[PDB]
From Swiss-Prot, chains A, B, C:
The active site is at 60 (charge relay system), 90 (charge relay system), 165 (charge relay system). One of its GO terms (molecular function) is serine-type endopeptidase activity. It comes from Escherichia coli O157:H7. Homotrimer. It catalyses: Acts on substrates that are at least partially unfolded. The cleavage site P1 residue is normally between a pair of hydrophobic residues, such as Val-|-Val. Regulated intramembrane proteolysis (RIP) occurs when an extracytoplasmic signal triggers a concerted proteolytic cascade to transmit information and elicit cellular responses. A membrane-spanning regulatory substrate protein is first cut extracytoplasmically (site-1 protease, S1P, this enzyme), then within the membrane itself (site-2 protease, S2P), while cytoplasmic proteases finish degrading the regulatory protein, liberating the effector protein. This is Serine endoprotease DegS. GO terms for biological process: cellular response to misfolded protein; protein quality control for misfolded or incompletely synthesized proteins.
Amino acid sequence: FDSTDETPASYNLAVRRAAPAVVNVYNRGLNTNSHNQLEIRTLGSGVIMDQRGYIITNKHVINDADQIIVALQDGRVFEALLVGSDSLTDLAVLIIKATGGLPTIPINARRVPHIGDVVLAIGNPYNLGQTITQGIISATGRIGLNPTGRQNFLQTDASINHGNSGGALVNSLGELMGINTLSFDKSNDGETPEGIGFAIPFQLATKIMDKLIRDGRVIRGYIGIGGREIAPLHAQGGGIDQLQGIVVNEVSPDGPAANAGIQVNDLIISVDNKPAISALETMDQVAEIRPGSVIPVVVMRDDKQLTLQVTIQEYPAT
Amino acid sequence: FDSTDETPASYNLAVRRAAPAVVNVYNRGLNTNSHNQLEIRTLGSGVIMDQRGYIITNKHVINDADQIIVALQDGRVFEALLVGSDSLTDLAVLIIKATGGLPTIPINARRVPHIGDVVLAIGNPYNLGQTITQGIISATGRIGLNPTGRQNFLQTDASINHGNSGGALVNSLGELMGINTLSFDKSNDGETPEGIGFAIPFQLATKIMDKLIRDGRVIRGYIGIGGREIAPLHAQGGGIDQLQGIVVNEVSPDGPAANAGIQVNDLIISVDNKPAISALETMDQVAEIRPGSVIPVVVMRDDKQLTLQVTIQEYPAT
Amino acid sequence: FDSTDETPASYNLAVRRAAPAVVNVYNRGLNTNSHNQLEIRTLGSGVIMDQRGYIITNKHVINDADQIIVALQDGRVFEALLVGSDSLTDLAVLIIKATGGLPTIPINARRVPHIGDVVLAIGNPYNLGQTITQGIISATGRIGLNPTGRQNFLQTDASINHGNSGGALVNSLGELMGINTLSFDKSNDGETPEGIGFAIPFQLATKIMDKLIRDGRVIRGYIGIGGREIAPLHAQGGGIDQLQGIVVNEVSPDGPAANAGIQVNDLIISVDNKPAISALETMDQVAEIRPGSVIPVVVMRDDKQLTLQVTIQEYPAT
């Protein structure tokens, strides 16, 4: 009978701290039919990353824009400069030149996201203004730039929507956990799954932002090798006293490893002075190495250690 | 190892306080094929609003009923009188004559719903008896009766279902936040969206109930004008010293404004002594004014203030 | 500005206590096209029930396996023996012979699941490793083995998926509340509903496990009678002073009741010395009675009490 003095369970604190940094992003076209001007071709969410005015949204919200417009919850509207984008992650960065003072996403670089943590997925879009949803972290993501990985997304059961994808995934304190990404069949804002949605983990989103600001695109390194891990894996003892490694299957012809030269069954033990313990770790490592770089790769060949010297190239198209 | 003395996180308190007021609503037909009697043509949820026995459900659960039956969780069954309904909101009110004492929905007219608050959507229906779901408020709704608005629904990610729609949306204390409404493609109990569901905000649901009890239907006022707001909007300073207003586009021919008479480019500054600051506010205001009413409308016409006097009519069909 | 010392709302405690008992279950076939070996025909989740190595998964994950493989989160892999299964519940039990010490699901036989309690649905499967989701208990289930019941499932809005169904439903303390069951259209791992998902309640899952370990299958008793409850039901007074009972409709011909012999309108008042108060209770009771058993059934026939003696048979195919 006395609700009066009680307090409803709520996540409005996360909302108050994070939402003013989450922006409407508009993709405007100039028509060809009757004379021209101001058509909205699509609409999406973006997140203000720093003072200075860099913003992340989805590449799919900005593709083929003639002009990119940004509107804040406080009423200010800006025209945006496209800094660059990346297909594999569906992220783009924009920049805005502003008037004394922007609201920014809270970010805690020391926070470790845990499976089971509560998250809110904050956008705007639909009926009017804002869709916000609640769920949990289902699976932590990896932070790699390797173009074949399938585990570089945090997964959540918070609904991720067209009113969702360009925006912020945050925990109950309003700290950024990831960038919302509409979730896996193709062409601006509605999908097939249900249950599970995806975001770019925030330390990956930050990495990719710094890459775009500095090169205009995500430059990924490449070694030109396919292969599987030798010694049977896991069970933390069972045991220690034999060296792991990557047996080589495939050597891209006229790839960096082929040049150099490296042959099918010869067993990679070390790459750029790190032990080659896992196929997956090692291809993420190679991906961050700048092209033009010369690195040592140690192999065992006929019971002998060879050190070859390899010059990294860029991962090549599609 | 010691779960024994701990307490599981739970919303069962909201359930215990609110659920006994949430009722099964049955729509029974008399057949035409073999001889007649007792067929259930559809089934839905309703909410007991006050002692006295008024109940809200969905119009779609009650349309074309020959007889309306109500069953409580405590075993009592009643036949219901249809008091009236409204298509635009998909609400209907019923009344029941009862035996000493009904369980009623807790309602707190002082509570302000916040974006991020936890809500449970309580029904009965399917497999047997009750579907209850949990989510958050995604967007607060407006409380207007203007028939073109698209923001008069609270939005939630709690699942809203056929076992859901006639019932109560409540917060963690069991206070009513809204009426569940199945959610946007047509004909008794299953839908297309996912992600986002809808309810009538509770102060709108209460308003519409009092309207039905007193007139048998929702009588909406009408002025017979389409138009857009002049001076560029928002940013809380930028600035103060010029009067907002509604420029007139369209004047319904032989509508109230046309009678009176009011012409295309002439700029509404005030309606029924309230400043005309926003298109949306002003059309909600007109909607609550009783038909037959004579009100002053101030315009600026050729740099001159005219006051016309306008007699409100009812908003007309479909 | 100070997130630093605060703590994010989270269910990671339930995860840490329950997840190490939730296993990958693989169904491997030997090919017929090119020469043979190791194909994965489907993949699912299972739950370790006790030391000793009994595991529950879904019957649908194991059907037609040539070999059943089990992988723990700690890296250990086992080959599994199929102990038995049950179509009506989509459960199977497996057994594994292990090396000093298994992680087991926490189970609290004294805990009473409440409508509104938070639950996590823990699996592994998809992109890589784990899907976990969060929701509430929507409806408590019954624990009966009667093959026509439709209320023997707990219902939840936690998403239940292919990365879900063989695994554990648990509350915020990590205690087992039920077995996840993909949720109602047919053939290994994706569905039609949305909103509502299903699990076997844990006291039913335990019952069915003990039955499989001891007989290799779920043996259900049968009486060979269809019928409805006499005196109008519910409202806890209204009143006490007349005996409930089951009027008999239908008597399976050459069923146990027919033998014995029992006739259409004659009114069951007691079964195996329990009052026959409810159709549903009484058919669950009959289902647990072992076949071969001789029990008294009291009826009222022409205002007279007859006691017949009935020998229970097994419920017969499909």
